[PDB]
Design a protein around this nucleic acid. Structure first.
Ligand SMILES: Nc1nc2c(ncn2[C@@H]2O[C@H](COP(=O)(O)OP(=O)(O)O)[C@@H](O)[C@H]2O)c(=O)[nH]1
Ligand SMILES: [Mg+2]
Lengths: 131, 171, 141, 158, 338
RNA sequence: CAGCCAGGAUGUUGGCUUAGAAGCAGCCAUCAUUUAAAGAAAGCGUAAUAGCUCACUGGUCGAGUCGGCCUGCGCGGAAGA
C-alpha cells in the first residue's frame, strides 16, 4: 500500500455519497467472475453511467471508520466480505433486488443478500419497491 | 518466532502425554513419540499448547517455531491421515504390493523388493499407480523419496516413477 | 462465457471461402470439421455483407456440430476500407502516417450488435479511437 | 594502382590443407647477395595462394601474385616452410617420400628447374577498353610431373 | 535429437616447441657443454566422422578448438613431447568452407575417414644442435614454426539416398508414417515438419534406402515465407528426387500453376540440382473416388509437361506405397555410384 | 511484508516483417475506459493459439516489514610430499 493521502480521500468521497444515498444491497464475491462483473455493473452503467460505486473495502478499519459518522447501525459489517452498491438517484430503486435475483445466476454466494438498513430492518427478501 | 506465537488446537480423541520433554500424541490413527533439542519445553493448556524458548540460548525462537510445526506434522496425522501419490509411467513398468513389501518390475534383470516400515501401508488402486498411507511426515516422505531413487525420471521422456504433485520438465 | 471449454478464434476475412494459405485446416481439430464453414456460419454473414473479418467462439462440448453465435468484427479491420490507407504501418513512428477525424469511427462504432460496457455512449466514443494511433495516426477530436 | 591480375601455377612440397594470404615485408638477404629473404623491416608485400588438388607429399596449386618483384612468389611460399619442388636456390633440400618408386625419384632429378608457370593473364586494351583473356598450356615437364605424382599417390595411399 | 543447427568454428594448431639454451654445470666443474635439446612438434587437428553425432549443437557451444602446444626444450638435452592431436567428432556428410577465396577441403561419405585440417607448428632447435669448433659457445636457438590458423564454415548436409520434396501440408510427414520407421510430427497445418527427420525403408535383406524430409516453401529468392534456401542445402546428394503434388486440396487452390512454379524455383537454387532424375507422385487420392482421380491425374501431367508414369500414392491410406518403393529400388540398384 | 481463498477481463485475434507471432522472434507512439483492484504486460509450451503465472487488489491471520550506509568479530577464497 502507498501512503495515507488517497486512503483518507477514498473514505471521504464514500462518506459524502452517504448524504445523497438510497437503499443498497450486499454481495460476497469470494469466487467472482469478470463476466458476472459485467452483468450487475453494466446495469449500473445502463441506468446513468459511471457514477455508481461498488468499491469493496469492508476491512475492519476501512469502511467501519465512516460508520460512526453516518449510518451508525451499520457497524455489523465487521464480519466477512460485504460489498456496497450505492444509488444517488431515486429512493429504494430496483437495483436492491437485482443481486437476489442474480444469486442463482452463477453467483452462488452473494452475502445472503442481507441488504442495508434504510428502516433499520433485518435480513429479508424485499420486493415492494417504487417502480 | 511468529510460528510459535500462534496457538495450535488439538482435536478430540487424541491425548497428550508429558514426561518432561518426551511427548506422546497417540490418537485414532497410530502412535508416535518425538523429542526436541533439549532447549524448548512443552506446556499443556485447556485446548492449546505453548512452548517458549529458554534463556541463555542465542537461537531461542529459531527452534521454538520448529517445535509446533513438528507437532503440526503429527497432530493431524493421527487424526486425518497422510497420503502421497506416486506415478509410474513407461512401457514395461510393473508395480504391485504383497504383504508389507513392494515388488517392482522397473526394467532390472531381477525384481526389486523394498521392505516398507511398520507404520506405513501401501495399496494399488490400479496396476500402474500406488498410494502410500502413513502416520508421520518424516518417514512417509523418505519412503516416497526412496521409491523415486530407483527411477528418478529423465528430462527427456519423463519415464520412471514420480510424484503426482510435481511435473517433470521435458527437454 | 462459463468455463474454458477450449475456445479458439481465427480468421483473415469474411469475403473469402476459408482459404488454406492464410489459415489452413486449423479451424478446428478436436471435433470441428471444415465442411460446416459454409452451412451455418454463412447463414447471417452472407445476408448483409462480407467485407470485415469476424472472430468467433467454438462452443463445442460433445456434439459433432456447433452451437456458437457470431459477434462484432474488430475495430481495426475497418481502418483499411473506410478510414484510409490499407498497406499497413510501414514506419511506425518515424513521422505522422495519417489523420483521423472525429467524424470517422463515430457512428459506425455504434453498429456493433452485442458489444457494450455500460450505456455511456461517450465512453466508447473515445474508446473506439483507442485502437487508433497504434500505427502513427493523428486524432482530430 | 594494382589493376592487372596475374595468375601462377606452382608445385610445392608437403600435404597442404587450405589456402590463405601472406603479408610479410621483404628486403635483401643480410649475407648472400643472390637471396631475397623475408625481413621485418623490408618492403611490404601481399600475396594470395589457393589449392586445386593435393598429392602424396607434394601439391598442385593455383595462386595470384600482386607485385611482380624479384622472386616474390618463391619466398612467400617458402616462408610458410613449404618450399617449391625442384627449386635449387630457395626450395629446401631434396626429400623424396617414403616408398617412392625409382621412376618418381628420376622425375625429380629430371625436373631440375623451378616449379613455376603462368597460365592466365588479364589485361585492358590501350585504346579500346575491352578485356582480353588468354591461357597458357601446361608445359610438358609439368604434365609428366603431375602424372607421376598422380600414379604414386593412387598406388601408395590407396 | 529434435533440432538441427549449423555454425562455424575457429580451429588453431599449436606451434612447435620452442628451442632452449642452457649450459650444464656439475657440482665441481663450472664449465660444461651447451646443454639443452629440441622442442616438441605442435599438435595437429584431425577431422573425424561420427555416427552418434547428427548435428553441430556442440559447435555453437564451442566456437574455438585449441590444439596442445608443443613442450619447450629443457636441460639434460631434453626434447618436449609432441602435442596431442585433437580429434573432432563430426556427423557424416559435412562440408567445410573457408574465407579468402576458400573452397571445400573434402567430402565425407563414409564413417572412419579422418581428414587433416590443421598442421601444427614444428619444433625448434636447441644450442646443442649448433655444435661446432669455431663457435664453441652456441647462444643461438631457432624459434618454433607458427601454427596454422583458419576459420571453418561447418555445413551439415544429410546422406539422403532418396530425397523427396512436396507441397506444403501435402502429407510429406504422413508419407513417413508408412512402412518407414521414422515418426515425424504430423498435423494438418501448413509446414507441420520443420526439422529434417530422415527415415529408412528395409523391404528385404541386403537392400535398403534412406529417405529424408524437407518441408515445402513458397516462391522466394530471399529467406521469406519462413522457409527457404537454408533447407534446400540438405539436398544435392539425393540420387533420386521425389515430387509430391496434392489432389483436390481441402482449402488450397487446385494445382495448375503452383505445381509448375515449384519446378521453376528449383532451377535458380544453385544449378537446378544438376538436373537429377525427378519422379512425380501424387497424394490425397482416398478423399475422392479412385476412378475419378485417374483421368484428372494424367491431365496434370501434360498440363505441366510431365511424360512419366505419374504414380498415384495414398500416404495415409497406405495403398500403393509399396508399388512406388518397388519401382524406385530397382532404379537405385541398376545405377550404382560411379 | 510474506502466506491461504479468488479476480485476472476487457475495444481486442494491435499494425507492418508477417506461412504461422495474438504479452511472451523483430518498433513503440507506450495508448484508457470500462467496474475498478490489474500492464496492447516481466516468465513456462508450442506457431499463435487454448492454459499455468506475476506486479496489483479483495477477505482472513495480526505486529513489525523493506535495503542502502559506517564499523567490531567471523565464513569461502587457502592443494605437497
Ligand atoms: N486422407 C488422406 N489424408 C492425407 C494423405 N496424406 C496426407 N494427409 C493429411 O495431410 C495432413 C498434413 O500433412 P503434412 O504432414 O502437414 O504434409 P506437409 O504439408 O508436406 O508438411 C496430415 O494430417 C494428413 O492427415 C492421404 O493420402 N489421404
Ligand atoms: Mg508434412
Amino acid at each position: 500500500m502507498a501512503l495515507n493521502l488517497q486512503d483518507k480521500q477514498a473514505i471521504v468521497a464514500e462518506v459524502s455519497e452517504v448524504a445523497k444515498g438510497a437503499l443498497s444491497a450486499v454481495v460476497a464475491d469470494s469466487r467472482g467472475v469478470t463476466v458476472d462483473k459485467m452483468t450487475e455493473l453494466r446495469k449500473a452503467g445502463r441506468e446513468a453511467g459511471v457514477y455508481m460505486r461498488v468499491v469493496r473495502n469492508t476491512l475492519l478499519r476501512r469502511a467501519v471508520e465512516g460508520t460512526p459518522f453516518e449510518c451508525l447501525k451499520d457497524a455489523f459489517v465487521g464480519p466477512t466480505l460485504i460489498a456496497y452498491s450505492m444509488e444517488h438517484p431515486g429512493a429504494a430503486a430496483r437495483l436492491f433486488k437485482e443481486f437476489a435475483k442474480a444469486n442463482a445466476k452463477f453467483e452462488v454466494k452473494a452475502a445472503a443478500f442481507e441488504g442495508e438498513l434504510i428502516p433499520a430492518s433485518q435480513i429479508d427478501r424485499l420486493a415492494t419497491l417504487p417502480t | 518466532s511468529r510460528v510459535a506465537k500462534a496457538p495450535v488446537v488439538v482435536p478430540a480423541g487424541v491425548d497428550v502425554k508429558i514426561n518432561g520433554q518426551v511427548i506422546t500424541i497417540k490418537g485414532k490413527n497410530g502412535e508416535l513419540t518425538r523429542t526436541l533439542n533439549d532447549a524448548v519445553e512443552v506446556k499443556h493448556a485447556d485446548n492449546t499448547l505453548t512452548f517458549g524458548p529458554r534463556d541463555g540460548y542465542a537461537d531461542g525462537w529459531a527452534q521454538a517455531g520448529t517445535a509446533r510445526a513438528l507437532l503440526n506434522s503429527m497432530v493431524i496425522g493421527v487424526t486425518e491421515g497422510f497420503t502421497k501419490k506416486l506415478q509410474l509411467v513407461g512401457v514395461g513398468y510393473r508395480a504391485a504390493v504383497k504383504g508389507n513389501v513392494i515388488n517392482l518390475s522397473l526394467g532390472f534383470s531381477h525384481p526389486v523388493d523394498h521392505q516398507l516400515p511398520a507404520g506405513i501401508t501401501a495399496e494399488c488402486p490400479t496396476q500402474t499407480e500406488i498410494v502410500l498411507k502413513g502416520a508421520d511426515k518424516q518417514v512417509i516422505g523418505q519412503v516416497a523419496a526412496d521409491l523415486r531413487a530407483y527411477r528418478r525420471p529423465e528430462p527427456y521422456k519423463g519415464k520412471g516413477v514420480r510424484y503426482a504433485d510435481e511435473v517433470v520438465r521435458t527437454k | 462465457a462459463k468455463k474454458v471449454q477450449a475456445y479458439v478464434k481465427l480468421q483473415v476475412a469474411a469475403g473469402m471461402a476459408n482459404p488454406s494459405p492464410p489459415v489452413g485446416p486449423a479451424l478446428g481439430q478436436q471435433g470441428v470439421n471444415i465442411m460446416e464453414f459454409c452451412k451455418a456460419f454463412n447463414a447471417k454473414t452472407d445476408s448483409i455483407e462480407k467485407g470485415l473479418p469476424i472472430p468467433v467462439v467454438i462452443t463445442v462440448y460433445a456434439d459433432r456440430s456447433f452451437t456458437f453465435v457470431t459477434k462484432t468484427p474488430p475495430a481495426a479491420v475497418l481502418l483499411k476500407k473506410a478510414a484510409g490507407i490499407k498497406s499497413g504501418s510501414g514506419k511506425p513512428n518515424k513521422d505522422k502516417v495519417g489523420k483521423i477525424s472525429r467524424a470517422q469511427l463515430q457512428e459506425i462504432a455504434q453498429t456493433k450488435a452485442a458489444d457494450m460496457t455500460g450505456a455511456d455512449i461517450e465512453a466508447m466514443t473515445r474508446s473506439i479511437e483507442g485502437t487508433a494511433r497504434s500505427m502513427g495516426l493523428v486524432v482530430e477530436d | 594502382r594494382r589493376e592487372i591480375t596475374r595468375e601462377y601455377e606452382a608445385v610445392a612440397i608437403g600435404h597442404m590443407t587450405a589456402g590463405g594470404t601472406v603479408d610479410e615485408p621483404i628486403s635483401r638477404h643480410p649475407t648472400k647477395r643472390t637471396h631475397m629473404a623475408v625481413h621485418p623491416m623490408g618492403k611490404p608485400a601481399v600475396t594470395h595462394y589457393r589449392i586445386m588438388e593435393h598429392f602424396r607429399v607434394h601439391t598442385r596449386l593455383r595462386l595470384r601474385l600482386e607485385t611482380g618483384r624479384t622472386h616474390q612468389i618463391r619466398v612467400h611460399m617458402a616462408h610458410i616452410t613449404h618450399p617449391l619442388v625442384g627449386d635449387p636456390v630457395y626450395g629446401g633440400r631434396p626429400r623424396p617420400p617414403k616408398g617412392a618408386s625409382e621412376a618418381f625419384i628420376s622425375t625429380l632429378r629430371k625436373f631440375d628447374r623451378q616449379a613455376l608457370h603462368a597460365t592466365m593473364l588479364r589485361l585492358y586494351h590501350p585504346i579500346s577498353g575491352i578485356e582480353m583473356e588468354w591461357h597458357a598450356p601446361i608445359p610438358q615437364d609439368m604434365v609428366e610431373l603431375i602424372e607421376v605424382m598422380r600414379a604414386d599417390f593412387e598406388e601408395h595411399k590407396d | 535429437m529434435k533440432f538441427v543447427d549449423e555454425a562455424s568454428i575457429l580451429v588453431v594448431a599449436g606451434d612447435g616447441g620452442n628451442g632452449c639454451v642452457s649450459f650444464r654445470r656439475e657440482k665441481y666443474i663450472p664449465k660444461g657443454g651447451p646443454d639443452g635439446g629440441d622442442g616438441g612438434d605442435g599438435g595437429d587437428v584431425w577431422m573425424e566422422a561420427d555416427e552418434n553425432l547428427n548435428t553441430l549443437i556442440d559447435y555453437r557451444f564451442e566456437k574455438s578448438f585449441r590444439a596442445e602446444r608443443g613442450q619447450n626444450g629443457a636441460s639434460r638435452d631434453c626434447t618436449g613431447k609432441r602435442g596431442k592431436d585433437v580429434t573432432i567428432k563430426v556427423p557424416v556428410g559435412t562440408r567445410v568452407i573457408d574465407q579468402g577465396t576458400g573452397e571445400t577441403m573434402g567430402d565425407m561419405t563414409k564413417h572412419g575417414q579422418r581428414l587433416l585440417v590443421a598442421k601444427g607448428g614444428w619444433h625448434g632447435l636447441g644450442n646443442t644442435r649448433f655444435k661446432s669448433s669455431v663457435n664453441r659457445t652456441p647462444r643461438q636457438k631457432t624459434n618454433g614454426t607458427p601454427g596454422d590458423k583458419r576459420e571453418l564454415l561447418l555445413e551439415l548436409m544429410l546422406l539422403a539416398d532418396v530425397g523427396m520434396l512436396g507441397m506444403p501440408n501435402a502429407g510429406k510427414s504422413t508419407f513417413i508414417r508408412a512402412v518407414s520407421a521414422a515418426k515425424p510430427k504430423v498435423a494438418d497445418y501448413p509446414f507441420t515438419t520443420l526439422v529434417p527427420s530422415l527415415g529408412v525403408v528395409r523391404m528385404d535383406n541386403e537392400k535398403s534406402f534412406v529417405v529424408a524430409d524437407i518441408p515445402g516453401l513458397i516462391e522466394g529468392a530471399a529467406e521469406g515465407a519462413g522457409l527457404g534456401i537454408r533447407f534446400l542445402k540438405h539436398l544435392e546428394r539425393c540420387r533420386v528426387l521425389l515430387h509430391l503434388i496434392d489432389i483436390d486440396p481441402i482449402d488450397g487452390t487446385d494445382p495448375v500453376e503452383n505445381a509448375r512454379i515449384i519446378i521453376s524455383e528449383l532451377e535458380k537454387y544453385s544449378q537446378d540440382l544438376a538436373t537429377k532424375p525427378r519422379w512425380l507422385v501424387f497424394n490425397k487420392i482416398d478423399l475422392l473416388d479412385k476412378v475419378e482421380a485417374e483421368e484428372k491425374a494424367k491431365a496434370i501431367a501434360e498440363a505441366l509437361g510431365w511424360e512419366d508414369k505419374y504414380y498415384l500414392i495414398s500416404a495415409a491410406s497406405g495403398l500403393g506405397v509399396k508399388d512406388l518403393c518397388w519401382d524406385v529400388m530397382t532404379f537405385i540398384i541398376e545405377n550404382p555410384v560411379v
